[PDB]
Every structure is written in structure tokens, then in C-alpha cells.
From a paper:
Semaphorin-5A (Sema5A) is a bifunctional guidance cue exerting attractive and inhibitory effects on neuronal growth through the interaction with heparan sulfate (HS) and chondroitin sulfate (CS) glycosaminoglycans (GAGs), respectively. TSRs are a unique feature of Sema5s and enable interactions with heparan sulfate (HS) and chondroitin sulfate (CS) glycosaminoglycan (GAG) chains linked to the protein core of proteoglycans. We determined four Sema5ATSR3-4 crystal structures to high resolution (1.56–2.72 Å); apo state and complexes with nitrate, sulfate, and the heparin disaccharide mimetic sucrose octasulfate (SOS). Sema5ATSR3-4 is a rod-like dimer; superposition of the various structures indicates TSR3-TSR4 inter-domain angle differences, which may contribute conformational flexibility to the Sema5A ectodomain.
Residue numbers in the entry:
A (entry chain A): 654 to 716, 724 to 756
B (entry chain B): 654 to 716, 724 to 755, 768 to 773
The structure:
């Protein structure tokens, strides 16, 4: 019974923000070797970048002068497709 | 050589999307026990929830009737503090073909 050399680290689960890498070795000719077949380490500890997506422009409205508004969504993510902007919601009221 | 009882799984590394929990044990009266002092299992494999944050309302503007608009930001995250709404950006501006034969 002998322990083989440690294998290469696997792929990190997360590209950023914290992931785990696993390294494996094989015990030969026995089910009970002294040591461990699997080790785990931290990987990709760099903070995820901040993705910014701008909302569609508000319809032009009078203040003559006209103005329109927009907002930005900010999120710390690895995939830009995970951040999305929802539908435009409009609220109305009457003033006399 | 003797293995102690398994310890608690401790805290999962990730709150959602996949994490690992580790439980530890101690080898007694020996430096070479058959087995491992630590075991790892999967935890919190459920996909992360979609967090929604609404933007501040635009100032009321006439169409009398008044109307205002707002948007919502949706993101798959574990911490709501990681999702934020940015600053309000405003664009401003000021406000016939005669055919004489
Ligand atoms: O030096 S500062 O005090 O200005 O800080 C700059 C960093 O602040 C953020 C996030 O705010 S914080 O969490 O309070 O730190 O953003 C804000 O400032 C930038 C403008 O920087 S500038 O040098 O004055 O040009 C704005 O970017 S921009 O859209 O105007 O182009 C941010 O506007 S936005 O809402 O993100 O669209 C503004 O955000 S906020 O109104 O305070 O919430 C960091 O931006 S972040 O990385 O997107 O969060 C700035 O860091 S950076 O490296 O300078 O971009
Ligand atoms: C494997 O583990 C260590 C060496 O890495 C020793 O306890 C022994 O060689 C075992 O087979
Ligand atoms: C792997 O771990 C270390 C090297 O990183 C040594 O104890 C030995 O090479 C083992 O196979
Ligand atoms: C501990 O691991 C197992 C028992 O859980 C055996 O290989 C042996 O008792 C070892 O000390
Ligand atoms: C470890 O595994 C379980 C507890 O997690 C039990 O079979 C026993 O305590 C063992 O040592």
C-alpha cells in the first residue's frame, strides 16, 4: 500500500467571490491508507466585478423644457446575463 | 489507534448555489490511523433566489393628470446588499415645409 502523487487541482467552482478546488490521490492495493484521498482549498478569492446596466429612458415629459430620467442597476456578479432590468411601471394620479 | 466520533458539519461554505460542509474527528493514541480525520459533504445546492430592488420614483410630471415612472433590477444573488440601484440620470432639452408652387 502506497500513496500516489497528488493530482492537479480541479476547476474552481466560482470564477470570483470564493470557490473550492479539489486535489485527489489514490491508495493502491488497499482500502485503508494512512492519509487522505481528497483535499480542498480556496480559489478565485478576488471579489467579483460590479456589473452596471442602464434602464431604458423615461418618456420625454415637460418640466419650454423637456426632461427624461433613467437609472442603473449595479450587482457583483460573474455572468452579465444574471443581471436584468424589469418592466417599466407607470403610476398616475389626478391633481386639480 | 482509535477514531473519535464525528464532529458537526459546521457552516456551509455557500448559502446557495453549492457549498461544502466539513466534519472533523481526531485519531487517538496513534499518529497513523486508517481513514481520514475530516469528511466533506454537499450543502445548500438549491439555486440562489432572484432578488428584486425597485428604483426610486421619477418626479411627478404632467401628461390635470400627473405620471411618474420607475424600474426594477433583478439579479440572482445570495446577499441583497450585493444588489444596488444607481444614481438618477437626467437628460434635458429646450423646445413645416411651405410648398409655394
Ligand atoms: O470617488 S468616489 O467617492 O466618487 O467613489 C467612486 C466609487 O463609488 C461608486 C459606488 O459608490 S459607493 O459605494 O458610495 O462608493 O460609484 C459612484 O461614483 C461614480 C462616479 O465616479 S466619478 O469619479 O465621480 O466619475 C458613478 O459612476 S457613473 O455612472 O457616474 O459613471 C456611480 O454612478 S452609478 O450609479 O454606479 O451608475 C456612482 O454610484 S453611486 O451613485 O454612489 O451609488 C463606485 O462605482 S461602482 O464600482 O459602480 O460601484 C465608484 O468606484 S469607481 O472605481 O470609481 O467606479
Ligand atoms: C500516503 O500518505 C503519506 C505519504 O503522503 C504516508 O502516510 C504514506 O506514504 C501513505 O501511503
Ligand atoms: C502531495 O503532497 C505533497 C506535495 O504537494 C507531498 O506530501 C507529496 O508529494 C504528496 O503526494
Ligand atoms: C478509524 O476509521 C475506521 C473506523 O471508523 C477504521 O479504519 C479504524 O477503526 C480507524 O481507526
Ligand atoms: C461518524 O459518522 C456518524 C456521525 O456523523 C456516526 O456513524 C459516528 O458518530 C461516526 O463516528
Amino acid at each position: 500500500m502506497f500513496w500516489t502523487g497528488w493530482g492537479p487541482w480541479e476547476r474552481c467552482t466560482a470564477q470570483c467571490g470564493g470557490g473550492i478546488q479539489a486535489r485527489r490521490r489514490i491508495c493502491e492495493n488497499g482500502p485503508d491508507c494512512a492519509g487522505c484521498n481528497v483535499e480542498y482549498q480556496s480559489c478565485n478569492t478576488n471579489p467579483c466585478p460590479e456589473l452596471k446596466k442602464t434602464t431604458p429612458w423615461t418618456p420625454w415629459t415637460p418640466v419650454h423644457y423637456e426632461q427624461r430620467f433613467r437609472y442603473t442597476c449595479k450587482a457583483r456578479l460573474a455572468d452579465p446575463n444574471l443581471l436584468e432590468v424589469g418592466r417599466q411601471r407607470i403610476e398616475m394620479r389626478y391633481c386639480s
